[PDB]
């Protein structure tokens, strides 16, 4: 019995291996039931002679037995490929591999890419001492898995804590000051981040037309600021969360792709960040640089929460119910305030998809050397906390509020929001009309629903079935 | 490769001039370039990683970018670092390397064995990745280096493998300027053919500027 | 050894229970009617809802779902007895009568991933997508032979031992007489049943993201064979079984498993609706009682959550209803499909109209600008790679035959893709050829596209030609073009914001109770039945939070679906008054001097515009269920074309 660690890089389809078989004789039709099969990669040689005797009658043939397939007790059966953990491989050295054999409830406990520890019997394949070159006496090795542990549920105590956390008067302020506490400034940024982390309400109308509750946030800013740090924190803080760039990741894409395997003809779908973080948050860093097909795809991944792929094989509509937290720089690098809105070259259709856009500037005020001192303390006191929520509890609370409560606007809240929306639409139209340029940032019904979503998120932090006028 | 006499190390530590001895002790077969030697020694020792709570990672790796016009010992510096460093691996922006920046999964050519061929950024997780000819990378290589050098991880989504696997390396890179000659009239960014996000993730940018100096030329020629 | 079962108590009880369940005459005779109906239309498979069986006899239901072949053979014996009782001649005309299963399978509803070995020999329901069909092969079930030497004719039967032990004597094909006289087979007297193997894959949008897909092999036997083609999302009900290996001497213990289908069904959106006589009566009442404004009643009731765009909604109703295809005697063809393009400012609910038609229309296919690229949009030609032969592959617009392709972000689609869809958008066919194969596939679809203008937003001060970045050849085959414009008028904002905020407050009755969140996660789907293959319908929606109150009702979605299905079949004939009006209308439309200055043409007026006047008038007449294209229909068509084809350029 060995215990080894590793990463799983292949997982075969679950198949059927017999634990008990029954064989029937071709002539006398008598059966030889419930023969026990050896577990693992071990075979069975059928008896070469029928048991039944009747001296008056002639004998059965030499090899008379045939597996009766319906009288067979089969169990689930999977073969895995374990690679040596990348941190365990010696320096100039190829990784080692190990074949694993799973059984009956160890099947599908792991997926390729999991880091696992295995307990199992270090065994050889016993398929008959046949299949004969150079290596003699060598039989293929595998581990017969007896236990799988994947290296990485709201108990009523946790639930009671979540209820009393929502019931706090200043739950919004606790959450807001608890998200990126080690980042100086950006208080409204952090409040918006909290709202994105909870999200609004996803609605399906009677006509079948869905409406998203997921909030998309864009951070345009100067490169000094901590917005990549903010994306990193958010992807550690959300239950489902993926950090990527506009061009995807190293050996991962941004959106999904679909391909047919010419041999097996299966439709393989590569998971990009958008479909991997379904039900969660995608943090697209360096949003401004992105390949054109990805832009066209995130047009409707950000609004319809789907990715429609159609190959000559098939047509699919993958789910991407994900919030988008995006960060980008100005087209000139720095904001260059005199350039108005000519320093962002995002098309209006992409900016429309975003609920809130934050422009972030490094002001050159001298008293913001408290910000330097703040960094120095953070790097001092780092190795060794206020009244707030640690990361794990925040993750659990966000997941809990997302699954339990979906708020709706109250009537008077809706009235107030309608009037405010009309006011700001008139203001934006007037600002366009007065200025000699169409506004690069639009205010549309999509922004009305954005404010509805932010109000619903605020109400959801408090587990409130209806969103008041306060959170509107 | 395990040390038994800390005593000599500590005695050298009290030398009160150990720093300059260390700096003079790197790339002994390269003449001059003392600022690059200070930077490379600093990177070779590295800073302190730290992660307040578990949510504010800051690396301690000192990434160094040597950008200099040709024939200025950049590749010799990278080879010295590969010799001295434990867990150093060498890679290039061209296709002329055993290991490549990007992770992929395939059947190994000599093993015939289905292997997650983790890239050169994760093969040097606790060490240093040396990228020669940094400005001549793919778009794929560029997003790979950007991910490893911002997140200190590499995210696979290839076969059925969805994994994230750690690349906490120090990146030491050598690049050439645009046009094969560094122009000090321009900024470093518009000299090098690297985007701003890639350059910002380096602590030390060594501009290896080549000029005709008869004394320095003579000393180098003698060397 | 050959024995017979003189008494099988279990078989007796099972057959009696199944015949009792089928007799049904006392219990409103549903299966009585179903069996007479399969006798009528000359079938031999009876599709049995297991919910009815679970009601009448729960013990049988459990036994059948858990011991599938024993119970299914008992139930097919009972079915043959029932048919013979109802009609002995038909019953003798078929050797075997099969029972297919239907309804709700509790834990027996799986996907190719969750179909594990704990289901062997149980009836299971598997949903997925067909990846490969095989050829339809005949399998000999009864071979007849003639010996010319002795004039004898013999016959040899082959039992279906697909998932049972086959001894080699079971599969010997007779070639010789006992005297070693050559036999010759009577092919027309022998009996062959056809056989097909498909592979069903887990649906890509249902599988865990990033993992490799899981498949299951499926056996289809006679009358179930051509029921699925690669790329279909089907539901297969059958028995899960372990296939026999070949007679060995050593076995590794591994068995190939397979699903033996007892029923195959498609997405129920694309199936013929069931029409109770009350439904037909209601449809006739609707059409006859309200005839002048029935079209507007249907149109404004189209996408209730979208406020405004009433002309767009009328056009989309016309697309859902369609014109009438002309099939001339010399083989010439004129399309009856309406193609609609929406160009507009961002966030004016055009992606929402596309999605509504996707939800509502049968055989609607989605696509985005760069999600489909030529071959993925129209057909393709690949090589079989195992037979060396060319194979045709249907793309999006072939799969949307007699349906709709809802192309979104049509502008971001590449130019070659739009060139590719030119030929489909007018001729309703895809001409495809590599050297070994050439074909002319039917793609009779209507295209509903959404685009954005150049510069992202529409420029009120530029010509619609300069603002739609498409050429007259592409535009002209879009027979209606709607510029959906974001005007920031404050009273329009009143209306829209009120409607939108009102849709964001509605809770579905009963299901929602005050704070619920909808999502389920990757198990809850298989927990209950799929509402994609699942089997009293009012006319108007009751008043609710969707609307405040007024003297004008809202057609129910279900009733509208049934009504549109009935009306789509109609073929109204153009009358002479309509023909004269349309001809003079078109002649007036072509002449620009009728249309004001400072008013530009959104799309050119060609003979296609005349054809679309006819198509829209015909669709309107279909809505009224007229059977004639009257002058009101022609007027509605002309006013829609007039609204669409001209835009006021401002300054
Ligand atoms: N300062 C120096 N001291 C010692 N040797 C040097 C020095 N500068 C250059 N050389 C020698 O010059 C040769 C060229 O060096 P190297 O290949 O490292 O230059 P490079 O910067 O890589 O050029 P490129 O940019 O074209 O790759 C080397 O063999 C190196 O030994
Ligand atoms: N007139 C309207 N009535 C109801 N809802 C509307 C209306 N206009 C916009 N909306 C809302 O705006 C949101 C975005 O709409 P949609 O995504 O369909 O815009 P779009 O026109 O496709 O934008 P783009 O052209 O940029 O793709 C939808 O949720 C929709 O509910
Ligand atoms: N206000 C701040 N508070 C704390 N750290 C900051 C702040 N601004 C910048 N930093 C630090 O600067 C480093 C680089 O910032 P980053 O977020 O990577 O920049 P960018 O905005 O270009 O992505 C980060 O480690 C971050 O911690
Ligand atoms: Mg950044
Ligand atoms: Mg070099
Ligand atoms: Mg859209
Ligand atoms: Zn025998």
Coordinates of C-alpha atoms and ligand atoms in Angstrom, one line a residue, chain A residues 205 209-212 299-300 302-304 348-350 352-353 444-447 449 453, chain C residues 303-309 313 342-355 408-409 411-412 450-453 456 484 486 492 495-497 499-501 503-504, ligand 2:
Chain A
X205 CA -39.7 36.9 -17.9
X209 CA -36.6 36.6 -22.4
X210 CA -33.9 36.5 -19.8
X211 CA -32.5 39.5 -18.0
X212 CA -29.0 39.4 -16.4
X299 CA -20.3 41.4 -27.0
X300 CA -22.9 38.7 -26.3
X302 CA -21.5 40.1 -21.5
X303 CA -25.2 40.8 -22.2
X304 CA -27.0 37.6 -23.1
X348 CA -19.5 52.5 -27.6
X349 CA -21.1 49.0 -27.8
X350 CA -18.4 47.6 -25.4
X352 CA -22.5 50.1 -23.0
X353 CA -22.0 46.5 -21.7
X444 CA -28.8 53.6 -22.2
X445 CA -31.5 51.3 -20.9
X446 CA -28.6 49.0 -20.2
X447 CA -27.5 51.5 -17.6
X449 CA -30.8 48.0 -15.6
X453 CA -28.7 45.5 -10.5
Chain C
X303 CA -42.2 40.1 -27.3
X304 CA -44.2 41.6 -24.4
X305 CA -41.1 42.5 -22.4
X306 CA -39.8 44.7 -25.2
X307 CA -41.6 48.1 -25.3
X308 CA -42.1 49.7 -28.6
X309 CA -40.8 48.7 -32.0
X313 CA -42.8 43.4 -34.3
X342 CA -32.2 45.3 -37.7
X343 CA -29.6 48.0 -37.6
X344 CA -29.5 50.2 -34.5
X345 CA -27.9 52.0 -31.8
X346 CA -26.5 50.0 -28.8
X347 CA -29.0 48.7 -26.3
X348 CA -32.3 49.1 -28.2
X349 CA -33.4 45.5 -27.6
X350 CA -32.5 44.0 -30.9
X351 CA -30.5 41.1 -29.4
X352 CA -33.7 40.6 -27.4
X353 CA -35.9 40.3 -30.5
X354 CA -33.5 37.8 -32.0
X355 CA -33.7 35.8 -28.7
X408 CA -26.5 38.6 -34.2
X409 CA -23.8 41.1 -34.7
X411 CA -21.9 43.5 -39.1
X412 CA -19.0 42.0 -37.3
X450 CA -29.0 42.3 -36.0
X451 CA -26.2 44.7 -36.9
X452 CA -24.8 47.9 -35.6
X453 CA -24.1 50.9 -37.9
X456 CA -21.2 52.0 -33.4
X484 CA -33.8 50.9 -34.6
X486 CA -32.0 55.4 -29.7
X492 CA -40.2 58.0 -24.7
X495 CA -42.5 55.0 -21.3
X496 CA -39.5 52.7 -21.8
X497 CA -38.1 53.1 -18.2
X499 CA -41.9 49.3 -18.8
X500 CA -38.4 48.1 -18.0
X501 CA -38.6 48.8 -14.3
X503 CA -40.4 43.9 -15.8
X504 CA -37.6 43.9 -13.2
Ligands
LIG2 N1 -37.5 49.1 -25.7 C1 -37.1 48.2 -24.8 N2 -37.9 47.5 -24.1 C2 -37.5 46.7 -23.1 N3 -36.2 46.5 -22.8 C3 -35.3 47.1 -23.5 C4 -35.6 48.1 -24.5 N4 -34.5 48.6 -25.0 C5 -33.5 48.0 -24.3 N5 -33.9 47.2 -23.4 C6 -33.1 46.4 -22.5 O1 -31.7 46.6 -22.8 C7 -31.0 45.4 -22.6 C8 -30.0 45.2 -23.7 O2 -30.7 44.9 -24.9 P1 -30.0 44.2 -26.1 O3 -28.8 43.4 -25.6 O4 -31.0 43.5 -26.8 O5 -29.4 45.5 -26.9 P2 -28.9 45.5 -28.4 O6 -29.7 46.4 -29.2 O7 -28.6 44.1 -28.9 O8 -27.4 46.2 -28.3 P3 -26.2 46.0 -29.3 O9 -26.7 46.6 -30.6 O10 -25.1 46.8 -28.7 O11 -26.0 44.5 -29.3 C9 -31.9 44.3 -22.6 O12 -31.9 43.6 -21.3 C10 -33.3 44.9 -22.7 O13 -34.1 44.3 -21.8

